[PDB]
């Protein structure tokens, strides 16, 4: 079967950029050539078919040229919602083949990270866990640091962290450090804070609250 | 008007078979083929083949060359793709799509179904709100949906009617094999006491269909 190589595997750009990706075939076909666009959470959509033909639909902003076996997808002016990684697929051969498909990642200005903490839950702690979970929401860049300190000491890997996508309209991220404890070493401790360092703070600001304290 | 609308998501064990549907309408049924992608959590598409409606026609790839089986029921314009015996490796979405006449790309495709092929047992969350907090500005407040198996958990606010500044993250797994996330929202402070705000918790494996009403601390 017919190889598709695109390329970068990943880039980033700014708002109003020109982008643009490349698909090679390990042999000729022709201009059998289709671009699609996968959101995270999505399936993928039509963009381009035949090489260069844009599908009804799309805006104009996105092209496709090249033949043979080199073809390049091109965004003139990049958007937000553009967030995506975007697969070629050939059609000259059976089987019909894609590429492992590139992330485009959008670049923008620095934003700081607004930071919440939130305590364990009432019935949670009925149920002999307790997790506290720190938000840091909407935030650029991805490059944030998260710090649990309990009672003052510092804590090692006691905590699991998640992150969201690009926003499709702000290009910003959010994550939710969650420490998890058991009520019973839980109740030990007084003083639960998360302390954030990020590009756009001037200096760490640490979120803290004390154990049962209304 | 062209639609492809693909059955939910399944959660089967090793060694059991499966059969995931696809509905086409908007559109003649028999006029067009219709094609399998699968695509593994994580990694890229794969072409699993192509099929005519109307007849014996059938094309797939090597990898799934006598793996699995595309087939059609022209009277409900509803498409299939099954296997004999599931394997771990299985788990994946599975988008099926419509190939354009004169061409081989796919015009449309359907909003995929998630297949997940494992020994490990189902178990409902457990969901628990996370509380906000002379006044106002900015709060916010959400919901920890706890201890689950496996992927995918639902988190809606208000029955959906709270959209915006919405963020459910990733599901982590942690060390006891279990799935946890967390589902947030930032709100105007105003609102704490006058507007009241519920998080709509669905874990469809296990019938989970959870109401947690998110109010205010003390």
């Known amino acids: 079967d017919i190889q598709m190589t695109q390329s970068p595997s990943s880039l980033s750009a700014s708002v109003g950029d020109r982008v643009t990706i490349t698909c090679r075939a390990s042999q000729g076909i022709s201009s059998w050539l289709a671009w699609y666009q996968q959101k995270p959470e999505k399936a993928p959509k039509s963009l381009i078919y035949?090489?260069?033909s844009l599908q009804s639909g799309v805006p104009s902003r996105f092209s496709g040229s090249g033949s043979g076996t080199d073809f390049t997808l091109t965004i003139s002016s990049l958007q937000p919602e553009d967030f995506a990684t975007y697969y070629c697929?050939?059609?000259?051969?059976?089987?019909?083949?894609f590429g492992q498909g590139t992330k485009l990642e959008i670049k923008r200005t620095v934003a700081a990270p607004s930071v919440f903490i939130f305590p364990p839950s009432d019935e949670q702690l009925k149920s002999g866990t307790a997790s506290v979970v720190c938000l840091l929401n909407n935030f650029y860049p991805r490059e944030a640091k998260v710090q649990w300190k309990v009672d003052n000491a510092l804590q090692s890997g006691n905590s699991q962290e998640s992150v969201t996508e690009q926003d499709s309209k702000d290009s910003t991220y959010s994550l939710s450090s969650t420490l998890t404890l058991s009520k019973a070493d839980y109740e030990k401790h007084k003083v639960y804070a998360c302390e954030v360092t990020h590009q756009g703070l001037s200096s760490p600001v640490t979120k803290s609250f004390n154990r049962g304290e209304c | 008007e062209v639609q492809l609308v693909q059955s939910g998501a399944e959660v089967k064990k090793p060694g059991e078979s499966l059969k995931i549907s696809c509905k086409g309408s908007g559109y003649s049924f028999t006029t067009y083929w219709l094609g399998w992608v699968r695509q593994m959590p994580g990694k890229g598409l794969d072409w699993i083949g192509i099929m005519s409606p109307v007849d014996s026609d059938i094309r797939y790839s090597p990898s799934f060359q006598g793996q699995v089986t595309m087939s059609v029921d022209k009277s409900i314009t509803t498409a299939y793709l099954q296997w004999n015996s599931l394997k771990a490796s299985d788990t994946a979405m599975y988008y099926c799509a419509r190939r354009r006449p004169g061409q081989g790309y796919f015009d449309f495709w359907g909003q995929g179904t998630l297949v997940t092929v494992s020994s490990s047992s189902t178990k409902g969350p457990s969901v628990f709100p996370l509380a906000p907090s002379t006044s106002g500005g900015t709060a916010a407040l959400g919901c920890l949906v706890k201890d689950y198996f496996p992927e995918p958990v639902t988190v809606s606010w208000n029955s959906g009617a709270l959209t915006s500044g919405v963020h459910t993250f990733p599901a982590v797994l942690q060390s006891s094999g279990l799935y946890s996330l967390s589902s947030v929202v930032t709100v105007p402070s105003s609102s704490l006491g006058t507007q009241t705000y519920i998080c709509n918790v669905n874990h469809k494996p296990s019938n989970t269909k959870v109401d947690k009403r998110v109010e205010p601390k003390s």
């Open positions: 697929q050939q059609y000259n051969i059976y089987p019909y083949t």
């Open positions: 035949a090489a260069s």
